[PDB]
Design a protein around this ligand. Structure first.
Ligand SMILES: [Cl-]
Ligand SMILES: [Zn+2]
Ligand SMILES: [Zn+2]
Ligand SMILES: [Zn+2]
Ligand SMILES: [Zn+2]
Lengths: 246, 396, 396, 396, 133
């Protein structure tokens, strides 16, 4: 509407997002460049200390890209909105400028968000695998509005004790996960090598999941339980347990 | 054709007007026209070339509109517009080259290249806007069955012909009466020569006539008529009509007598000029009749009397002449002329890409052969390619 | 240049459109452009310089905007606009004159006058609008290093040269073989003369070749080629190459044999026309090679056989000719031609104010000297002054 | 061109800087540029090579990005980068080869291959960054029509020419006066020989001249001028000017007298050196005029007196010589030279893939023919292919 | 000399790097150096001398800073930068020419022209950066 363009008749399942189509269909450099950044601001993957990490574009980390956003929306505040009734146009442009005129606060907020993310990610020990999950965390855009309009200039970083606690909990969870995997694999392999053909590996898998402490086993689907059994069978036994078994 | 011209005109206006610093009010209508062009061309695939050495080129149109609001154009606006304009100008140039290299005996006025045939679809009619050039204006007027007119400075209406007719002759070619002429372009030099100087002609007058039939009617024609023909007034060893031998011509120029230029239409006299020289106006004619007489001077000085004996041998041959130059005319059909480059553009495009000779035009687009046999199919194809060449000239 | 051109274009639009009774909607965009020009120029002091006899003139701009209140323009509105326009036209004409009379060897394309240098500042870019003239279009394309095109009717590409070459000669000048040519403007007239009529030639053929190098590449050229050379077909008394004596020429014109016209680019053959006369097209070339032959007629009637003996003396010298007129062409460089008035305007302005000779142009703006030594610096300065002359002729 | 250069420069910087163990702050900007390149190229299909034997190759991009938050690059990071770098280097090399083997008469400066035409799109402009090489800098300045020059060590400005001129001659070729010269690369060796040793010349001084017209202006040129021509200082048997007979040259070298070098531009004297040998500076010139003189030594020792008798036969021929070597210069146009590989690279690519001869360059990329007929269109195409060759040599 | 060299090096880097479409991260340090140059030069008058036929030229610096806040450089940015860069390049070229045509018997290593002597002041030392040639 700002550029007088015909509204996008978007189609679900299109390999292109609406912003990817807009980037090609918009000629203004401010808006097109901000759109290009949005279209490509996906996580980059990098392994640090043997842990896969999802890391941000450097322009997010230093907050420079907010300027580009500012540029784009300043352009949107100058646009005619050809057929738009003028009171609604004024309201839209003034809200655009409400976000626009917080450029310094938004750059500070982006830098703060990125720094907190990086510092806390340093404490992660298991690979940050990116998957589209069954359920989501619902984020209200009104809360985004609150954060954007209310953030000041008071820097808040994780406390060293908070970082140590987060890292310790991550390490404890990772270590327990590995130890329960080893226990389950050792028992399954012992039962098989002892020719315990009436043994149900399902109970072993359930005990393993229960010892992981974060699963309500009654709500684990059967196909995933059997897949877990199959994957546990393929793993080799840890040396100490295998020696005891021998 | 109207759509291709509209594309080219939009691109030319965009080039000339979308410039850094200019007021947006200078371009608002142009910006809307340009955006309409973009909308209409979007999502369409075109193919050009594939004939002779003209390369195959594919064109896909996915461009955004210009929606930015400004008081004055800046560099960003100009660069975006320039990218779009460059792609469109290349496409239009290729479509024009593709249409210029093609011909058909049937429906030679109709589009021949696939891209122009596609552009003739109804969906592209939205691109169409101001059709103000002489060639596109004539195209539209003709499509409306309205009388069109192409103005020509020095129309190339006469096919090249340097000929002669001998009315009295003999194997020695020493007592010859006849005419020699050059009809070239917009110029006609003619000269009637009598070797005996009309010594024995009735009343001592030898009458010469020269009829030149124009392949198309000319109107509003400004003609310069001069008494003498400088091309046939110097000694000349000319070939025999069959080429067996050569004869000698030793002109001595007398002023032509009873000069009558008749401009005729369907054999009826439209304009007549008697003993008039300089600028004359032939309003509407398809034929020119030049009648001029060699009149033996009744009273001679001894030097003159010695040049014209009573009997053979005849050394000084009495020649009267005429020069007729069409400076400007109007023709309903397209023609080559001295000021325009449409023929040259078409010929250049056909020669550069090695276009094989087709079933409509002569090889190399030779103008003499083309205008000698200026058939209706040839005329249709020529108007098509000339309109396309004028559209191409706007951008290339 | 673009700013000065835009000023002149705005003034021309105002003169043509701000007329009594006209709808304000006819002029609204023009009024906005004009008021933008007024706003941009207000408060700026200009001096048009005192080179030669051009008076030093000072220019101050403190004008009010043109009104927007009338539905139809009345006489009062036209008079106020006329006053402002008259001052602005005086200024633009003076700036154009001050630019035309200046030249530079180092950067001759850049502005030389102080006012045009000031107008190149960014603050004046707001004035810039539609650049639709051929010369401003070429200026902008050249600034972007794009393919420029200047279309010329009868381009003055050949420097004036009336010369002859004698391949065979003797102190008495009675058995002469060679060529004489006039290269003038867009015309070439060449003539090969053999006094013995190729009696002792290897096959009774005397070959003549004429090479004309064009100072610039010509394209899309329409060329009339005619057999005879009327300029070298009458008796002449000609100075010897050293001016010591005078020789006699008594031409008799034979039909040129094996006429081959080559148009060459970089020494490579681009266009070839053999035994073709009338209109031909040379698509892209910088050299013309005209090869023709005086072929002794194998058969002669007694008069012809008498003109050409077997040995000296020779009274009738066998001459073959060729005439080559460039009717229209396209060149990437500016040139004088038979239609445009750029050269005449620049020369008239330089002579009217007695501009001292400078380090670029010949000391009369004489075209033969200029085109003979058409250096890149000369081309740059000439393009600048011709563009300024076109801008001036929009108003004056 | 800027985009292709930026791609190649990014790949070179990735090869040099993305190395094991390096601080991320060393590579952050480069990693950002590299990722922008990946993003811009992802999802784009390219086709290179459909000319000569250059095989058709298709390029698709679906590459992942590189991390942005580690402190030091490790081997894992470099391995992640290297495969993408290899694919991109292959693509850039093929795009460069595709462009190098193509030419056009109309717009030789504009891109010719499909891939470089697609890379001219606005979307790819994001890849563009530091244009610091001499060729790309000259490309960008030349697009803006700014003054910019290429610096050449031993520029190959002279087309190969080993010729002689005889001012005094006769069929026996035993008393000859004239000059013989080699023009090759940046070297002029000229030698004036008098067989009679100017015995009967006025003042016993024989003047020799040699003019070499450079096809392009050289500026700020360093010249070595030595007073002998070792190339024309030993006995030779030389064909005649028509090849009908061979004559004999038996030089004896005398020091050249009144040695004058005039470096001229547009026929104006710019630099003048008299009796100066060693290093001289020619700031701006297109022509070199060497004037030298053989003076009879007024006093001769008995052997020297025997060498040169008062009259024929002349067995020892007095020769004076000059050698002129352009060590370095600046030219606004591109040239071959002793240091660069651009010409060699383009020739190698054209020969390895059997590129058919086009309409711009001489076959086999022969430099003598190319610099003999160095037209503006040839200059455009050569600058394009030489810039592409420099871009290619950044990676290959 | 180092200040004149740093001016020229900054201008050359700006001409090579401030190009349309480029990432701002490619030019951030260059933009900072360029703005430092503009700030140091603003308000200063220079006269390049009339030795020989070299024309007397006067130079005044009142320029705006190059902008930040773009992710990619656009055409407006390049145009503004080009105007400033062209003026600066003309000034530096004239200073170099004015220095190249002068000489003194003693202290011939020291600057000779007025502009280069002015540029040897402490206030211009801020311009100085990478001396790599
Ligand atoms: Cl060397
Ligand atoms: Zn006959
Ligand atoms: Zn003579
Ligand atoms: Zn070397
Ligand atoms: Zn010889």
């Amino acid at each position: 509407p700002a550029f007088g363009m015909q509204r996008m008749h978007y189609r679900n399942g299109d390999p292109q997002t609406p912003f990817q189509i807009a980037e090609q269909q918009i000629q203004n450099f401010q808006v097109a460049n901000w759109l290009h950044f949005v279209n490509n601001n996906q996580f980059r993957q990098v392994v640090i200390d043997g842990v896969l990490n999802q890391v941000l574009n450097d322009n997010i980390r230093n907050g420079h890209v907010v300027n580009q956003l500012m540029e784009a929306l300043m352009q949107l505040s100058r646009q005619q909105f050809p057929t738009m009734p003028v009171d609604y146009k004024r309201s839209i442009q003034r809200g655009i400028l409400l976000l626009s005129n917080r450029l310094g606060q938004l750059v500070d907020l982006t830098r703060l968000l990125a720094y907190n993310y990086e510092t806390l990610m340093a404490c992660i020990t298991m690979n940050m695998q990116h998957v589209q999950t069954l359920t989501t965390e619902k984020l209200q855009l009104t809360s985004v509005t609150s954060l954007c309009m209310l953030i000041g200039n008071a820097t808040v970083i994780p406390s060293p004790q908070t970082l140590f606690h987060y890292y310790n909990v991550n390490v404890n969870f990772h270590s327990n996960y590995n130890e329960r995997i080893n226990d389950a694999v050792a028992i399954i392999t012992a039962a098989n090598r002892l020719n315990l053909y009436q043994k149900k590996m399902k109970s072993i898998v359930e005990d393993f999941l229960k010892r992981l402490q974060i699963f309500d086993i009654s709500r684990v689907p059967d196909d995933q339980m059997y897949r877990l059994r199959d994957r546990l069978r393929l793993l080799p036994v840890e040396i100490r347990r295998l020696d005891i078994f021998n | 054709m109207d759509v291709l011209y509209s594309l080219s005109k939009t691109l030319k206006d965009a080039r000339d007007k979308i410039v850094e610093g200019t007021l947006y009010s200078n371009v608002s209508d142009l910006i809307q026209q340009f955006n309409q062009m973009i909308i209409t061309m979007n999502g369409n695939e075109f193919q050009t070339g594939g004939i002779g050495n003209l390369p195959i080129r594919n064109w896909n149109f996915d461009f955004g509109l210009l929606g930015t609001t400004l008081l004055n154009l800046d560099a960003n606006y100009v660069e975006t517009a320039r990218n779009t304009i460059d792609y469109f100008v290349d496409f239009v140039d290729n479509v024009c080259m593709d249409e210029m290299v093609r011909e058909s005996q049937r429906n030679g006025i109709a589009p021949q290249s696939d891209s122009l045939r596609k552009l003739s679809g109804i969906k592209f009619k939205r691109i169409n806007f101001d059709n103000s050039s002489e060639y596109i204006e004539n195209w539209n007027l003709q499509n409306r069955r309205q009388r069109t007119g192409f103005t020509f400075h020095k129309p190339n209406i006469f096919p090249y012909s340097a000929s002669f007719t001998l009315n009295r002759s003999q194997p020695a070619h020493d007592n010859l009466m006849g005419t020699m002429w050059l009809n070239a372009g917009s110029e006609i030099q003619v000269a009637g020569f009598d070797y005996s100087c009309a010594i024995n002609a009735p009343a001592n007058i030898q009458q010469f006539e020269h009829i030149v039939q124009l392949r198309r009617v000319l109107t509003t024609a400004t003609i310069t008529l001069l008494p003498d023909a400088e091309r046939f007034s110097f000694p000349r060893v000319i070939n025999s009509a069959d080429g067996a031998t050569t004869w000698y011509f030793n002109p001595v120029i007398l002023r032509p007598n009873n000069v009558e230029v008749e401009f005729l239409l369907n054999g009826q006299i439209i304009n007549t000029y008697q003993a008039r020289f300089g600028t004359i106006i032939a309003r509407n004619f398809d034929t020119i009749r030049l009648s001029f007489q060699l009149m033996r001077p009744p009273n001679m000085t001894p030097a003159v009397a010695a040049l014209f004996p009573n009997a053979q041998p005849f050394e000084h041959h009495a020649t009267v002449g005429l020069t007729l130059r069409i400076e400007s005319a109007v023709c309903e059909s397209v023609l080559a002329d001295a000021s325009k480059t449409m023929l040259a553009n078409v010929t250049s495009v056909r020669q550069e890409y090695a276009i094989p000779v087709g079933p409509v035009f002569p090889p190399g687009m030779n103008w003499t052969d083309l205008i000698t046999n200026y058939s209706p199919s040839r005329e249709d194809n020529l108007q098509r390619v000339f309109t396309v060449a004028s559209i191409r000239s706007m951008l290339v």
